[PDB]
Subunit: 276 residues, 2 copies
Amino acid sequence: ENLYFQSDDHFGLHGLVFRRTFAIRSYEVGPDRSTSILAVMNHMQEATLNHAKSVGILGDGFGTTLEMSKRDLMWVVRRTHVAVERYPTWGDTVEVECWIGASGNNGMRRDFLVRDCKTGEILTRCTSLSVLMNTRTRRLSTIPDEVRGEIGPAFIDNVAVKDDEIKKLQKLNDSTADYIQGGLTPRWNDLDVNQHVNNLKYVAWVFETVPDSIFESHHISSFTLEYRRECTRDSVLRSLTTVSGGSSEAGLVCDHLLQLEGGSEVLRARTEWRPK
Amino acid sequence: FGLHGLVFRRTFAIRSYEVGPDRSTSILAVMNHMQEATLNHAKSVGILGDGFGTTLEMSKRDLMWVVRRTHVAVERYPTWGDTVEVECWIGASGNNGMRRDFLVRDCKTGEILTRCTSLSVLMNTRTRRLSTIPDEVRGEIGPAFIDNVAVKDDEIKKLQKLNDSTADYIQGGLTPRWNDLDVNQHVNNLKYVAWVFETVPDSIFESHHISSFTLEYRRECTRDSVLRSLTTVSGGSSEAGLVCDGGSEVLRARTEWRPK
């Protein structure tokens, strides 16, 4: 019912939703033949960058528009929520539907829908919240009008994930964590365009302390991350995970924490699991 | 993607996470592409079998393919936004070996970016003994054989093990996780490559691109394996790879580098 959601040839309008097909590759699936959530998030990240190009948003970046680039501003992801119904397998063809939208006066949200091309079933729903940061002062910035003039006309109001589904996360008690791993350090290729560690590197470090027994038995159905701080090449991190068993009423839950070791919080995260 | 007639072809659009901070595609992304082209080829010539290359006649005789040598030649790494095309095919290699060869081209210029060949042999999973190729299995893969090579014998040198007591860089405690494992409890070959590069200092990745990569595999590892990676740098600019389990050799490898 939103005209600008449809493709260009539907209404003769410049559409604001990017679409792209992915065929699941061999190295993207685990021993259980399921695509990993890291491959799914890779897909959405790739669709992100393509989307900016498709709506007439400027030169990269990974981001980063001119008005932003003039003001030494960059996007930083501060929240991510992923809802997974079913993971595709090798050879399956999926389609990512992605777009951007406002989040208050100074936030921007990117939302994603991934469908199974054969069944038309929705496999993945996601939304990520980004904010502006000054690269020099490492300080959060409001969105200047020159930047709103760039990304604003690309906004649509649709959501893939309702607020109801996203719960504010509690930091786990790091002194009673079920699993802990320190000495985590980024290497040369793990860094981004501006001195900072890749966003999906963080996700990898989160899974460092998830026991293999949970990966063998369960699939991630929900994934929520709250980022609070960037990391550099000389960062050394500690990953922590706390398991909230599922053996009655309650399903399997994992709480997560990346900290600078020690012990300023880098992020907190929460995974919900379902039996395979 | 498409087969024509016994040479499979497939396009990859370079993805962002496949590209490094220098905007160059990593050698592992290239090897990721070929793993993918491998299985596509296999399916299209009808040798995929159980989903990974073990045919009906192979499994009955408890046989599976094992990679024993890989050589990758890279002229230029593609960058983000580039679209590449992979050519893959198989052929006989001696009396009991099978070779898989690869050509990767830039779709715009048509220049060859990467040439590669891998040698596989049959191994009994029960007796741990290399096996000859039974006629029943040759009957399966044989009609798919072609004689072309992407990499000449000339270009591949036998590797010497580095002195593990004189290694410039060493890292132990390397252990595989559940996701690092394949269908039959064994660690994935691209996990090995990751472990190889573990002891290559960031300074070399910053200064140089890999122009050549040669791997000789000796042994498989299991879920309870604990490994040590070793690298010795002898410019300019070569390094000799070694992967140790005790200290029994798992594989040896060799990279040649050129300034970016």
